[PDB]
Each structure stands twice: as C-alpha cells, then as structure tokens.
mmCIF file of C-alpha atoms and ligand atoms in Angstrom:
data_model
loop_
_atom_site.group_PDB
_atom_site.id
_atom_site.type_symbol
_atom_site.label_atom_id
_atom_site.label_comp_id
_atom_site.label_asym_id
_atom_site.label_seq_id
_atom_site.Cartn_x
_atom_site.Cartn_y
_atom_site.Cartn_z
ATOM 1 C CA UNK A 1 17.856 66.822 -125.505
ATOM 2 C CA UNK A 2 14.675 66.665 -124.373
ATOM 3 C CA UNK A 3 12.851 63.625 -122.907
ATOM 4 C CA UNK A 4 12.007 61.110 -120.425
ATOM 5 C CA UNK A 5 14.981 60.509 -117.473
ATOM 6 C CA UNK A 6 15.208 56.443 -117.137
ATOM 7 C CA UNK A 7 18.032 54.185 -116.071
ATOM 8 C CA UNK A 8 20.063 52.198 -118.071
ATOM 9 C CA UNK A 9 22.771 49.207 -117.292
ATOM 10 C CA UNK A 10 26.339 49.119 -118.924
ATOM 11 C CA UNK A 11 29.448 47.606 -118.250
ATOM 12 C CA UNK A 12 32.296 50.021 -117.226
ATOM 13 C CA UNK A 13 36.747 49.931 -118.600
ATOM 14 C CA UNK A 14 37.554 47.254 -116.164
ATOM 15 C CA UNK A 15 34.667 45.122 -116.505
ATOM 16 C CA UNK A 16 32.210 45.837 -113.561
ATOM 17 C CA UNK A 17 28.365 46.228 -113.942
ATOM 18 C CA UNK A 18 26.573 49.734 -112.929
ATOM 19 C CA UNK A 19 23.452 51.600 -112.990
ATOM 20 C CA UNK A 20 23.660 54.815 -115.553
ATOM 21 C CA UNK A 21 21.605 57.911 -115.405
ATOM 22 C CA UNK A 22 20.099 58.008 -119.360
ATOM 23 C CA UNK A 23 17.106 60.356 -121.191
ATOM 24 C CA UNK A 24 15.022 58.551 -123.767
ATOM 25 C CA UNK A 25 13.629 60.506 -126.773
ATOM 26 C CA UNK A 26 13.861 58.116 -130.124
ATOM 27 C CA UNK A 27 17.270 57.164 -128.552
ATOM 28 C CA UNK A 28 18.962 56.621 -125.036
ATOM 29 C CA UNK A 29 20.872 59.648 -124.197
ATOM 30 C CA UNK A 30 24.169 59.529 -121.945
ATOM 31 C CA UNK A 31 22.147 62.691 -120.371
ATOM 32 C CA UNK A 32 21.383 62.285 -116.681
ATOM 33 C CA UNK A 33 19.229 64.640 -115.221
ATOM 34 C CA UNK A 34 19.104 64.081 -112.123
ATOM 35 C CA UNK A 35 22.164 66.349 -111.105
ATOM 36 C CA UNK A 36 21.953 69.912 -111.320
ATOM 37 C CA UNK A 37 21.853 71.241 -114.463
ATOM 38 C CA UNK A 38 22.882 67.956 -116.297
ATOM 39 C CA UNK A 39 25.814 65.379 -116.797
ATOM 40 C CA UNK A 40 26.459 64.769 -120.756
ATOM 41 C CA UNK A 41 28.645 62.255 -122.322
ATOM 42 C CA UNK A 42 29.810 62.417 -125.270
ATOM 43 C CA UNK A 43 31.490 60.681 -128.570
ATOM 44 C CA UNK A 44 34.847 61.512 -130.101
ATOM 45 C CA UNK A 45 34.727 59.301 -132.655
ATOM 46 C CA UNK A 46 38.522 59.076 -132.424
ATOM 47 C CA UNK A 47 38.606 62.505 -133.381
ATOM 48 C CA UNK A 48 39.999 65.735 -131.823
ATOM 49 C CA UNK A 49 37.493 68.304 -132.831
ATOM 50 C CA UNK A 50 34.821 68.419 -129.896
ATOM 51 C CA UNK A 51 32.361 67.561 -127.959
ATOM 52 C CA UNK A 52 31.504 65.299 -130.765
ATOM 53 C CA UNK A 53 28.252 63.639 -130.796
ATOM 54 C CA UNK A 54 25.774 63.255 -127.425
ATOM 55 C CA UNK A 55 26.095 59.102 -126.459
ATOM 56 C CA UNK A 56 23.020 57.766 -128.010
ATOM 57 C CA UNK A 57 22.526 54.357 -127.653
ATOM 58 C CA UNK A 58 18.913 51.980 -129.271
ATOM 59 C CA UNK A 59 18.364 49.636 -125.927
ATOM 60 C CA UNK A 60 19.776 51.411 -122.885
ATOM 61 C CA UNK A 61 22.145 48.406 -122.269
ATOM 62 C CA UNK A 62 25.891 49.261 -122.403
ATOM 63 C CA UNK A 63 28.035 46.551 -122.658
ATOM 64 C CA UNK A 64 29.516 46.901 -125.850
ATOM 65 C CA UNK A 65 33.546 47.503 -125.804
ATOM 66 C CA UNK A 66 33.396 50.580 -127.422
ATOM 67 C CA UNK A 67 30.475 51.612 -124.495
ATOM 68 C CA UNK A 68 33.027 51.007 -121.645
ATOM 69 C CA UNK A 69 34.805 54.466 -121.336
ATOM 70 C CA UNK A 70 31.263 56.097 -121.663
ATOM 71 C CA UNK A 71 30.188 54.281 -119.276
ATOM 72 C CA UNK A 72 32.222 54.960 -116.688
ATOM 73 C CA UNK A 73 32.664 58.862 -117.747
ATOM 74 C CA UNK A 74 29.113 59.384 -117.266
ATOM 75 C CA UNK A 75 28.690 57.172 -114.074
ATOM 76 C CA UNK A 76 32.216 58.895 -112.420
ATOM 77 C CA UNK A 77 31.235 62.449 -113.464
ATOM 78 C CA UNK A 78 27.665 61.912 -111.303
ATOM 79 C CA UNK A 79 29.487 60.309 -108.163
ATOM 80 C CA UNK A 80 31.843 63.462 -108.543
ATOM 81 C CA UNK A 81 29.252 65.759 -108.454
ATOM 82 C CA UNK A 82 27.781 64.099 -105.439
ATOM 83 C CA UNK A 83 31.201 64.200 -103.491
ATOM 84 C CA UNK A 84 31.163 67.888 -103.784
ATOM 85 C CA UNK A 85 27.421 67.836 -102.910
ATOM 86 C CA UNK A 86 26.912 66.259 -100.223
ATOM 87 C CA UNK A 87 30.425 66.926 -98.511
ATOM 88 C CA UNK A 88 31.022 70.513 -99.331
ATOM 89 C CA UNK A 89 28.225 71.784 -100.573
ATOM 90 C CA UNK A 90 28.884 72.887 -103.817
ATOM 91 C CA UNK A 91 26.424 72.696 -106.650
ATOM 92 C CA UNK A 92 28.421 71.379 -109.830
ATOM 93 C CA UNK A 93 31.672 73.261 -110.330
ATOM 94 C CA UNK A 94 30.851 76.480 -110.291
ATOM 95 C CA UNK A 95 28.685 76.856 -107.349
ATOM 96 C CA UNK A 96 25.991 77.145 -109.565
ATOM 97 C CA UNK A 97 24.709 73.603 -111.149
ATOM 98 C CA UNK A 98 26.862 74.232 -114.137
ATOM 99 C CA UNK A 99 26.144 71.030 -116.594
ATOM 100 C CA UNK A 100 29.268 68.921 -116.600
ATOM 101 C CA UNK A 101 30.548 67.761 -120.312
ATOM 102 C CA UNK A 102 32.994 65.110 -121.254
ATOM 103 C CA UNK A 103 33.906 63.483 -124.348
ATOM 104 C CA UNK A 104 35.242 59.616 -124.422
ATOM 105 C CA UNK A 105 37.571 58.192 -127.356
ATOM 106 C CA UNK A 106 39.399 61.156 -127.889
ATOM 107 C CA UNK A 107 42.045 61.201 -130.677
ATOM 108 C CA UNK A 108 43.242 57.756 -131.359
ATOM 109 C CA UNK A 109 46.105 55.594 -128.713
ATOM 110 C CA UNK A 110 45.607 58.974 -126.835
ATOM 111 C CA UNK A 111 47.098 58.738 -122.738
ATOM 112 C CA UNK A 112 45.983 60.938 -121.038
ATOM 113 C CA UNK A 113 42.618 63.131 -120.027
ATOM 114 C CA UNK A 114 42.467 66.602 -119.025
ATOM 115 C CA UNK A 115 40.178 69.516 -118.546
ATOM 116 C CA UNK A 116 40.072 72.287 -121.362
ATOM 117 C CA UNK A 117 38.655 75.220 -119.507
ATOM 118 C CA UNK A 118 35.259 74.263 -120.985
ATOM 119 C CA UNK A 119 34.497 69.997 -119.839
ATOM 120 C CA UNK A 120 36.332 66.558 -120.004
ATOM 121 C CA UNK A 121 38.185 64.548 -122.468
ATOM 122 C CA UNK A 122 39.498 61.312 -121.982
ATOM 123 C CA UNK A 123 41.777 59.171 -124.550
ATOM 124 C CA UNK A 124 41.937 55.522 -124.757
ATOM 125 C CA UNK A 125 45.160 54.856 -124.035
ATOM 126 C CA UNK A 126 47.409 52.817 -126.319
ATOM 127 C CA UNK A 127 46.263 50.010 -124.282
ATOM 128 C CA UNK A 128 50.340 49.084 -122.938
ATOM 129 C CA UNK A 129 50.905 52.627 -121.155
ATOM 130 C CA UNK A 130 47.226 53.185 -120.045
ATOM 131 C CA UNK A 131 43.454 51.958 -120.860
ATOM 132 C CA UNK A 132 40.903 54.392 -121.354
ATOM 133 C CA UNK A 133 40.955 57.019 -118.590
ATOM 134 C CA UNK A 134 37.817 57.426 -117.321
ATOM 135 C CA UNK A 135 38.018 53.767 -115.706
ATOM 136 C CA UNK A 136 39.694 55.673 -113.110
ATOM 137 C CA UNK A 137 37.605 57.408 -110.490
ATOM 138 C CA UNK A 138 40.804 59.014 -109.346
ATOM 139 C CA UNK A 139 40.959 60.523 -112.759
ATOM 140 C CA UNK A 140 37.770 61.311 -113.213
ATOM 141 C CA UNK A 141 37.695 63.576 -109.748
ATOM 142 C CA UNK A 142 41.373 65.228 -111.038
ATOM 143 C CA UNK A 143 39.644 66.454 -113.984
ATOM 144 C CA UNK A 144 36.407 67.685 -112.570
ATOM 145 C CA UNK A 145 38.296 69.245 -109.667
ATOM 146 C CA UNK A 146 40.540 71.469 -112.175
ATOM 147 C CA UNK A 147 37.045 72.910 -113.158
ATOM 148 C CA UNK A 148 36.494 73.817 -109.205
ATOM 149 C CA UNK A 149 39.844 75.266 -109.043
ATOM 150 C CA UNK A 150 39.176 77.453 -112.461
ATOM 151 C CA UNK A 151 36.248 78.421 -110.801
ATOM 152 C CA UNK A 152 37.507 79.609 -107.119
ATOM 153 C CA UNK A 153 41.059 80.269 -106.478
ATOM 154 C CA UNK A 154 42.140 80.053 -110.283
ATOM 155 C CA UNK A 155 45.528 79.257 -110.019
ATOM 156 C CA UNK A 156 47.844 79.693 -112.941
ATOM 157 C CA UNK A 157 49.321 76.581 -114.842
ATOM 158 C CA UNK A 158 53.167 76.976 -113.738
ATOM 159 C CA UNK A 159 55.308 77.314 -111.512
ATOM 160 C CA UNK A 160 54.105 76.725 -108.123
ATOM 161 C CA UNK A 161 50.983 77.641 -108.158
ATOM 162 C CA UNK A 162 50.580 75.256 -111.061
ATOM 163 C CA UNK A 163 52.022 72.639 -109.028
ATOM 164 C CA UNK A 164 49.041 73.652 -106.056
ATOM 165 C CA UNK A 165 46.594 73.703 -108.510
ATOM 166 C CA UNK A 166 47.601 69.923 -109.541
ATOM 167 C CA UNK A 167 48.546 68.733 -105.759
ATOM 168 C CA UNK A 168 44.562 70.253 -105.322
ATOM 169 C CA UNK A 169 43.221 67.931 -108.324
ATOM 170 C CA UNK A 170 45.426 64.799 -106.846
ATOM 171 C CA UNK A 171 43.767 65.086 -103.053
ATOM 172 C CA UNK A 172 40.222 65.431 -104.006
ATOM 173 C CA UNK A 173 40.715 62.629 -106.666
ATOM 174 C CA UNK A 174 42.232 60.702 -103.536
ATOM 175 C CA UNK A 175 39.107 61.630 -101.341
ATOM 176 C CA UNK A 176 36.191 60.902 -104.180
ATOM 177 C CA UNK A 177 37.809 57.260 -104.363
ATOM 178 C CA UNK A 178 37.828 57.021 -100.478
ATOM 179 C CA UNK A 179 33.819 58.833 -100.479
ATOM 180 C CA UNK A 180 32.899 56.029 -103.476
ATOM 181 C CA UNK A 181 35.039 52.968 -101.551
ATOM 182 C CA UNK A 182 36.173 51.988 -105.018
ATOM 183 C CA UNK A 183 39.354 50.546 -103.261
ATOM 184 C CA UNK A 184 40.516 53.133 -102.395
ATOM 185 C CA UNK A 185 44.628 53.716 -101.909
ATOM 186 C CA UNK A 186 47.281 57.101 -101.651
ATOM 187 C CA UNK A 187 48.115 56.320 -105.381
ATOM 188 C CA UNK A 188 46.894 58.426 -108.726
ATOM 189 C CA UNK A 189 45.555 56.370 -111.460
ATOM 190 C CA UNK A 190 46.371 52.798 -110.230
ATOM 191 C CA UNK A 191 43.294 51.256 -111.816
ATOM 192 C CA UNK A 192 44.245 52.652 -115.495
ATOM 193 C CA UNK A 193 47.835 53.016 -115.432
ATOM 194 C CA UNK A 194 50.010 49.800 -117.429
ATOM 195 C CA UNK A 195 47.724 47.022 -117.404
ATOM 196 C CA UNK A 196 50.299 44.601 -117.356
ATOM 197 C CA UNK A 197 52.377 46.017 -114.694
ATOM 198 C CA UNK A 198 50.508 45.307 -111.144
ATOM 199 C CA UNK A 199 51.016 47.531 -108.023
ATOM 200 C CA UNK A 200 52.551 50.681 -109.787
ATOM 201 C CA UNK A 201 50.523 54.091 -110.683
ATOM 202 C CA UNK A 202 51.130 57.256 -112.241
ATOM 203 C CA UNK A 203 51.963 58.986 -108.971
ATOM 204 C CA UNK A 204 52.210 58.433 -105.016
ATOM 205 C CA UNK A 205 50.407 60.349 -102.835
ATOM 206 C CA UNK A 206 52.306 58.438 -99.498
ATOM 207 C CA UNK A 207 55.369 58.031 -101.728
ATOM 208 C CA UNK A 208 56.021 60.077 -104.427
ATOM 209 C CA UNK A 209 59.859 59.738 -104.525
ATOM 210 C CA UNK A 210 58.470 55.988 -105.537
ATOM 211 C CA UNK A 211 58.261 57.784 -108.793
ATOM 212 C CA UNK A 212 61.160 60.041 -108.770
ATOM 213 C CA UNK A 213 58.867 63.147 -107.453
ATOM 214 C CA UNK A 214 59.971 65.830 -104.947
ATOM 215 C CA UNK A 215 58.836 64.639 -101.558
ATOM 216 C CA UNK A 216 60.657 67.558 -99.883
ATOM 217 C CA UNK A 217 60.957 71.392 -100.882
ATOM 218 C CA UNK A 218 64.694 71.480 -100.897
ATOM 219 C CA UNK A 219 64.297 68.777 -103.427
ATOM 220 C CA UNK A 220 61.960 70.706 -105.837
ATOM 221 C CA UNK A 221 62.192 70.805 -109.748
ATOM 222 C CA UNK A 222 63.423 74.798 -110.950
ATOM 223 C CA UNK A 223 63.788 74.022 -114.478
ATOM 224 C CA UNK A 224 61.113 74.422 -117.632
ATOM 225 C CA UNK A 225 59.393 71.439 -118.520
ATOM 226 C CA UNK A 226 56.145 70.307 -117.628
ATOM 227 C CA UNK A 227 55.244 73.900 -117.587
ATOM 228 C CA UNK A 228 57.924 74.243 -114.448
ATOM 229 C CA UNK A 229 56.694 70.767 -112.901
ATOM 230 C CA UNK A 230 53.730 70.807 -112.020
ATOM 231 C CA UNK A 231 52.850 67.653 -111.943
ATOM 232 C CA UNK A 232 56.454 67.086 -110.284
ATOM 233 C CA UNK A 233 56.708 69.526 -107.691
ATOM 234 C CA UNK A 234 52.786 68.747 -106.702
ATOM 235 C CA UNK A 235 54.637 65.656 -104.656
ATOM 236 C CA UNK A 236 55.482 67.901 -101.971
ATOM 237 C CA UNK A 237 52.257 68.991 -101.689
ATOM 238 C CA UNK A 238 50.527 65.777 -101.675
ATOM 239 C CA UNK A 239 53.146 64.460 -99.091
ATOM 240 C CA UNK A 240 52.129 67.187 -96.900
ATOM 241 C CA UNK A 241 48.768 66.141 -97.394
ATOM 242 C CA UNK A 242 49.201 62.703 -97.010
ATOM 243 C CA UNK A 243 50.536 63.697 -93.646
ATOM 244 C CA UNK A 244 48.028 65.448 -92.729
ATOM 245 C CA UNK A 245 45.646 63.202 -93.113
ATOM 246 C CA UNK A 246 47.426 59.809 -91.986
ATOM 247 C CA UNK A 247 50.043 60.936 -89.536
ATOM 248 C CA UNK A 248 53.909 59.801 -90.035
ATOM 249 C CA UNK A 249 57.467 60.944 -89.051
ATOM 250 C CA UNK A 250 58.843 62.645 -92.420
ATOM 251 C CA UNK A 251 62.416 63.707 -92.594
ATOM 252 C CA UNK A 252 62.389 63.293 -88.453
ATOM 253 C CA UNK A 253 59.240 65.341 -88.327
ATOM 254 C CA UNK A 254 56.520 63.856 -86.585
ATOM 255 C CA UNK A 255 52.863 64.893 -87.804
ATOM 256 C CA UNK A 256 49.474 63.548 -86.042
ATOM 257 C CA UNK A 257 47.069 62.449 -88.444
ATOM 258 C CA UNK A 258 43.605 63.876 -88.252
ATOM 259 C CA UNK A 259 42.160 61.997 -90.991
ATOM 260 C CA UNK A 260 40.518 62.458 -94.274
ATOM 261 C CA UNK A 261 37.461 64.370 -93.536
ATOM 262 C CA UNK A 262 39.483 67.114 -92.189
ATOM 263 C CA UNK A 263 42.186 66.861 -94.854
ATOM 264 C CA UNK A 264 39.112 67.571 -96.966
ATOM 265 C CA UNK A 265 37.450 70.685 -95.318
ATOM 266 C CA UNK A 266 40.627 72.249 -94.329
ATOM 267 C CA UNK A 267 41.747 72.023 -98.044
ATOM 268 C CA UNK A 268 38.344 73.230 -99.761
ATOM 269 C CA UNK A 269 38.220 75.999 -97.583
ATOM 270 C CA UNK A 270 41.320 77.402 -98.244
ATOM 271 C CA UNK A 271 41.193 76.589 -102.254
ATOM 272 C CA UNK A 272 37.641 78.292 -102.043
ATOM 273 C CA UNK A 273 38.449 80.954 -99.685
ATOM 274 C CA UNK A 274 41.918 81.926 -99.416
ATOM 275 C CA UNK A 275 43.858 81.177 -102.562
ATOM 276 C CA UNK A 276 44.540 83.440 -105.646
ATOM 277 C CA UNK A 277 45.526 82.797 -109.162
ATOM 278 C CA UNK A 278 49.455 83.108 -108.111
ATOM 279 C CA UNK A 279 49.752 81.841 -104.736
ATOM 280 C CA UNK A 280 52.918 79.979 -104.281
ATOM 281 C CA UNK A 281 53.484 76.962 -101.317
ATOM 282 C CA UNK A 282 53.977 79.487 -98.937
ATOM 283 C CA UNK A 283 50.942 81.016 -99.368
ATOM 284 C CA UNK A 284 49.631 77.855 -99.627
ATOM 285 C CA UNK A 285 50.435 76.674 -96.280
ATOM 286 C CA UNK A 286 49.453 80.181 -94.453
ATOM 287 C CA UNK A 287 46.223 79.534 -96.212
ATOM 288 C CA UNK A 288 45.846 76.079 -94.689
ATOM 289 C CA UNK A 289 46.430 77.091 -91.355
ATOM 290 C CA UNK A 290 44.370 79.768 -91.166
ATOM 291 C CA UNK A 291 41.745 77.499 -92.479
ATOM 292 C CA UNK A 292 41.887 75.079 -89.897
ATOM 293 C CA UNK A 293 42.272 77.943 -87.465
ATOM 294 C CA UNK A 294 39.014 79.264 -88.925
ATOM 295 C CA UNK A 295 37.163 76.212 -88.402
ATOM 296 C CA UNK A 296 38.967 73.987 -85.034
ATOM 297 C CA UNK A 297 40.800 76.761 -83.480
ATOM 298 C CA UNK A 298 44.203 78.596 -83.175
ATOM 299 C CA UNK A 299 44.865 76.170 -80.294
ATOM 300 C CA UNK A 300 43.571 73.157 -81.974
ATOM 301 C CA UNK A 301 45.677 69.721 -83.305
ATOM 302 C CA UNK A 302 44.083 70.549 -86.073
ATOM 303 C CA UNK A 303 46.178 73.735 -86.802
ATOM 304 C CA UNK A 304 49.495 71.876 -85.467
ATOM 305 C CA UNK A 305 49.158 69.109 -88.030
ATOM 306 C CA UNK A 306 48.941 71.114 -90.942
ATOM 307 C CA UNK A 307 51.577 73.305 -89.309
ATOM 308 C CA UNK A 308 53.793 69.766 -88.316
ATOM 309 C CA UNK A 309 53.055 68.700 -92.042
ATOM 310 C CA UNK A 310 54.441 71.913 -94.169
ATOM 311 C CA UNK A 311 57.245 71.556 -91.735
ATOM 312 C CA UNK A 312 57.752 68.039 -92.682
ATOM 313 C CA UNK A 313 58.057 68.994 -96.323
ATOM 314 C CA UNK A 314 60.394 71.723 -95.671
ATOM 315 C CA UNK A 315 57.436 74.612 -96.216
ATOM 316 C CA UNK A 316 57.832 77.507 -94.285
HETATM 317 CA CA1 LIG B 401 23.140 49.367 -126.499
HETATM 318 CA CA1 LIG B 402 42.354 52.620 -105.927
HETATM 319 CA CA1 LIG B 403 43.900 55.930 -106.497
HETATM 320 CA CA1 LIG B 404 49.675 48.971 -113.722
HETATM 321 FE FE1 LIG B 405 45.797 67.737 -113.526
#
C-alpha cells in the first residue's frame, strides 16, 4: 500500500493499551513503515489459505475483540525487529530489511503459531488450551527468530539440530521479553498458555523437567515424534542456557552466571557465524565456546561458563 505513515491506538489479547505503527490511504493499514522494509499484518479470516487480506481498519482505533491478536502481532513483530536492531545489529531477518509478514486468526480453535519459511501465522487458540498467540511476546520473538535461523545457520527440522534450531527460537524469545520488560520470566508462552490455569507455561527454560523435558543429555528423547523432539530435546539446550546466563549448580556442576547480555552475543554469534544446517549439540557447544573465546578471551569466565554449562547438561 501506498500512503501516509500515522499512529493508531488498539487494545492488545490480554487487554493492555498500545501505540501501533498504521498507513492511511482510504483505510488504516496494519503497515508500519517505520522499520526497514515494512511490518504487515494481516487477516485470516479463519481461513488457512494465506496471507489473507492486509488489516484495514475505518478509524485507526483498535479495540474491537476481533482487533486484539492484530494488534499485538503487528506491535510484537516491530519490538522484535528492534531487539535484533539495536542489540545485534541485524536489519530484519535476513540482514537485509526483509519486510516481516504475519497473518492473525488463522484456521479456526487453531493452538499454535509457527513460521512457514515465508512470514507468521498465529491461531486463536480454542480459548481453554491457549488464547490467541501473538499475545505472547515470547511467541512472537520464537517465530521471528526461526526466520533468522533460516536465514544464517539453517538448521534442519530434526534430530538435533532441530532441537538447536528450537532451543535458538526459545532463548531469543526469552531475551526480547527481558529487552521489552513485559514481565519477563525463564518460561515459554506463560502469558497465552491455559487461561485458567495460573503459573504454568508451555515450557521451562530454568526447569524444563517441570514439564517432563530432558534437562540432561543422558536423558534425551531417540525416538520419532515431534520430528525426533525437537521441541523436547531443546530442554537441554535451554538449561544450558539458562545456566549460562543465571549461574546454578546442575547435576553437582557449578556454573557462574554471566548474565543475559552475554548469553545473547555469545549465542548470535555462533548461530550467525559458526553453525551449519546439521550441526548437532556437540557442535553446538564447540561453537559456543569458540564464540565467547572470539569475543572475551580463551582465558576468560566467559569461556568457562559456557564450558561449566554444556558440562552441566552432560554435553561434551
Ligand atoms: Ca477501528
Ligand atoms: Ca513473562
Ligand atoms: Ca516468557
Ligand atoms: Ca496458564
Ligand atoms: Fe519453534
């Protein structure tokens, strides 16, 4: 579309008021800008063919219950894209400004959201297991960050480096919440997950065994569901990261924590730089220690705690 960039007000899934990002030409546009090369929002109607229809809207105010999940796709998608931005430098998820797509009220009593090699789609939920998706910032950041890993290291759906590739979407998730301060917590999809059920969440970051996930290698899933687990065996993964970041004794191994930020550039760097379409965990964790070697030094607590960490999680 082409028109005038403006600002519009909505109401987001669980209820809170925020700015949106809109283009006016006849109609408001869910069509901001502002960010690279575009963030579009789109309709499903409740239908599975896609991207549907461009959001249009007659008043720029979004407050309508059927605006909710738009609302917060669009807004989620732009804080996203300013994570990567602004903390790694990375223009959109290509590199390159690519515009970032997603459709909203996908199918119908649909739960769950996912990437399709091409932009977002987010279901409703059936409103007992889940409410729509994109209220979840977590989510939101899972999704776009399977775009960054398609892009970069492109690891393959299964096995373990399908499991990496999912443990990768569940830590930058974790860190957009903690760059946004949307309450942020270890856990995936808290703020979407069972509506009635307080305190739970699809998966633990700082837990996952909360949930029946691997939290340990020796522990790991071999069979053939879930595409060979990989959003099971990604617990052992995020466990290691979790230690990383916050510290702990796992298993009697004691790791330091050296915090977020540098959960966060060791991580990118070795998804951007070091990974390949088949690397497995122990790849994975040679990658992470040479990144962290790269950029604190081979002598640095830095390197031990990711080295401390895999060893935690039985990673060798
Ligand atoms: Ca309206
Ligand atoms: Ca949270
Ligand atoms: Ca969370
Ligand atoms: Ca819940
Ligand atoms: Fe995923």
């Amino acid at each position: 579309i082409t028109g005038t960039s403006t600002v519009g007000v909505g109401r987001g899934v669980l209820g809170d008021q925020k700015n949106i990002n809109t283009t006016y030409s006849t109609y408001y546009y869910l069509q901001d800008n502002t960010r690279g090369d575009g963030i579009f929002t789109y309709d499903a109607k409740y239908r599975t063919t896609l991207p549907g229809s461009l959001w249009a809207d007659a008043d720029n105010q979004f407050f309508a219950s059927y605006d909710a999940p738009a609302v917060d796709a669009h807004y989620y998608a732009g804080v996203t894209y300013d994570y990567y931005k602004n903390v790694h430098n990375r223009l959109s998820y290509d590199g390159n400004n690519a515009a970032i797509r997603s459709s909203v009220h996908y199918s119908q009593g649909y739960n769950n959201a996912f990437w399709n090699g091409s932009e977002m789609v987010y279901g409703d939920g059936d409103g007992q297991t889940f409410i729509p998706l994109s209220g979840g910032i977590d989510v939101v950041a899972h999704e776009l960050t399977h775009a960054v890993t398609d892009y970069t290291a492109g690891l393959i759906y299964q096995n373990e480096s399908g499991a990496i590739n999912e443990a990768i979407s569940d830590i930058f998730g974790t860190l957009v919440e903690f760059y946004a301060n949307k309450n942020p917590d270890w856990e995936i999809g808290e703020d979407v997950y069972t509506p009635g059920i307080s305190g739970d969440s699809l998966r633990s970051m700082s837990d996952p065994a909360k949930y029946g996930d691997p939290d340990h290698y020796s522990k790991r899933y071999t069979g053939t569901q879930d595409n060979g687990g990989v959003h099971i065996n990604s617990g052992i993964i995020n466990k290691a990261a979790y230690l990383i970041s916050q510290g702990g004794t796992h298993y009697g191994v004691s790791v330091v924590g050296i915090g977020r930020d540098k959960l966060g550039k060791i991580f990118y760097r070795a998804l951007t730089q070091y990974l390949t379409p088949t690397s497995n965990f122990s790849q994975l964790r040679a990658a992470a220690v040479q990144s962290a070697t790269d950029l604190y030094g081979s002598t640095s607590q830095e390197v031990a705690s990711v080295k401390q960490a895999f060893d935690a999680v039985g990673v060798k």
